[PDB]
Amino acid sequence: STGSATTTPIDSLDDAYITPVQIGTPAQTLNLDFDTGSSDLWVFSSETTASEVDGQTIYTPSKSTTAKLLSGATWSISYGDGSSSSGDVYTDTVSVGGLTVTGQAVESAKKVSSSFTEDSTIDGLLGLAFSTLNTVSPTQQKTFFDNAKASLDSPVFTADLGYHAPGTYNFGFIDTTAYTGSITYTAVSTKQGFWEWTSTGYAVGSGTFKSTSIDGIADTGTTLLYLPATVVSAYWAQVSGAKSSSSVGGYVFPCSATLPSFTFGVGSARIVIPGDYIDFGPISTGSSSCFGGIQSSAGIGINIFGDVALKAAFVVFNGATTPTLGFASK
Numbered sequence: 400s401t402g403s404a405t406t407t408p409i410d411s412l413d414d415a416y417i418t419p420v421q422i423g424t425p426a427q428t429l430n431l432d433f434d435t436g437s438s439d440l441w442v443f444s445s446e447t448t449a450s451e452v453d454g455q456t457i458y459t460p461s462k463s464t465t466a467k468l469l470s471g472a473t474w475s476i477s478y479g480d481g482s483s484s485s486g487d488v489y490t491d492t493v494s495v496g497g498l499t500v501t502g503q504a505v506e507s508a509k510k511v512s513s514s515f516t517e518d519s520t521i522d523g524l525l526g527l528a529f530s531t532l533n534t535v536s537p538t539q540q541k542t543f544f545d546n547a548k549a550s551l552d553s554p555v556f557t558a559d560l561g562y563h564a565p566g567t568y569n570f571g572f573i574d575t576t577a578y579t580g581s582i583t584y585t586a587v588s589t590k591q592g593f594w595e596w597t598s599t600g601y602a603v604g605s606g607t608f609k610s611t612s613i614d615g616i617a618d619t620g621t622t623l624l625y626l627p628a629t630v631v632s633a634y635w636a637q638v639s640g641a642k643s644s645s646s647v648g649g650y651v652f653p654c655s656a657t658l659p660s661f662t663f664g665v666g667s668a669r670i671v672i673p674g675d676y677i678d679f680g681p682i683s684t685g686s687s688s689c690f691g692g693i694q695s696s697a698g699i700g701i702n703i704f705g706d707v708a709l710k711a712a713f714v715v716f717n718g719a720t721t722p723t724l725g726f727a728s729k
């Protein structure tokens with residue numbers, strides 16, 4: 400089997416991407432944030448505290464003839480940005496782009512933090528990291544990808560995120576028309592439950608490539624590119640007037656600037672992030688201070704190849720017995 404779904408930026412900055420997901424019988428379509436940095440499929444629901452729902456589409460398990468309470472199971476998750484949600488668990492039929500899994504754990508939110516409420520465009524998350532990170536207790540549950548894997552033509556999914564445009568998530572096949580050149584594959588460690596890999600270095604603009612190992616994660620659910628402070632300082636030193644602002648919480652730069660590109664290594668290959676991808680616009684409405692798309696990971700404890708990096712590439716999440724990542728230009 401295969402599936403193919405379009406993923407669409409939630410706003411003009413590509414702060415996140417939503418992908419329609421069918422849940423239940425008859426289908427209830429929710430727009431989920433596909434997140435290769437977590438392993439829970441959780442949704443706004445008929446059980447979510449009413450004051451915490453503000454425009455989201457909800458899953459109502461009582462209207463699904465295939466929904467079953469997973470008795471005793473609860474979930475609770477905290478994200479790197481301080482946001483959180485928790486609740487109980489149903490199994491139900493879940494379809495993405497034509498690919499159907501029966502008996503998928505659908506985690507129904509009873510509570511969500513203010514940030515989730517305030518984002519009307521995101522009806523929940525669909526985790527695509529390793530199932531070892533799934534938060535369901537007392538019986539850990541499998542991701543949608545892990546449940547689909549055995550049925551897929553090839554045990555893979557691909558992320559093809561757009562810059563200020565729709566893109567695609569494919570399951571079970573590699574669309575050879577969606578990238579240029581060849582796919583370079585690189586080793587993955589699953590020890591922390593992430594798609595964790597080692598970049599071979601970087602360049603800033605037309606500068607010379609610096610060979611240096613940068614361990615980090617391929618994370619579609621993180622907006623920005625978080626790298627070591629040395630690398631980030633080297634980038635922003637090429638932008639007149641850029642500075643790290645403690646008050647704003649990262650590197651800012653004059654909105655009048657034209658940003659240099661950023662290149663990262665994948666083995667002997669190179670992925671070039673155009674400068675415009677690194678512009679996240681005014682810090683506050685009408686400001687001439689703009690927020691940078693490359694930020695320090697020093698305060699996180701991991702480097703994160705988020706959307707800024709991944710949307711410059713066609714990315715293969717290879718879930719073969721030994722997982723690997725693939726990157727191609729596009």
Ligand SMILES: C[C@@H](NCCCF)c1cccc(-n2ccnc2)c1
Nearest residue numbers: 414415434478480482514515620621
């Ligand atoms: C509440 C929500 N806001 C996202 C706003 C733009 F998208 C949030 C805050 C912190 C982290 C995350 N997150 C989700 C998966 N990985 C990380 C989401």
Ligand SMILES: C[C@H](NCCCF)c1cccc(-n2ccnc2)c1
Nearest residue numbers: 414622623647648679680681682690
């Ligand atoms: C939503 C966005 N960048 C992507 C989300 C961070 F992963 C942005 C645009 C303008 C300003 C900020 N900002 C201000 C203080 N800290 C952050 C963030």
